[PDB]
Amino acid sequence: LEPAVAIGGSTVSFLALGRFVFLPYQRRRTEMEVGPGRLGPKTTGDTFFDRLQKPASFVETKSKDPSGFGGWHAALGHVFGYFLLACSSLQDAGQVIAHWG
């Protein structure tokens, strides 16, 4: 019900889940997928400034495989998976969603 405890307790649970139990599975699962290049063509010498993966170091900062943007990506679980529970206003608005039967 409380928005502060439903989307706050959500963020941390989705973050800790993705950082403690679903991180090696995600890293092991993303190894079979290749990047944007059309099977690796010449880019720098052909002016392909948009397809090249963004640099910004992209190296280990934490431990056991970190995540720079994954901490902001997997964090969307906070609003994707619990802003729905946070907005469950139909439990007190009369519109019953129990679906009897």
């Binding site: 997928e33 290749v34 990047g35 944007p36 963004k54 995540s67 943007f69 994954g70 994707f80």
Partner: peptide, 23 residues
């Protein structure tokens, strides 16, 4: 909007169409 973040652009997340088709 939530479905438009499926494929992999120049970041470290997303999906690859060739990998899904080969799998």
């Amino acid at each position: 909007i939530v479905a438009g973040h499926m494929y992999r652009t120049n970041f470290g997340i997303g999906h690859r169409l060739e990998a899904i088709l080969e799998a």
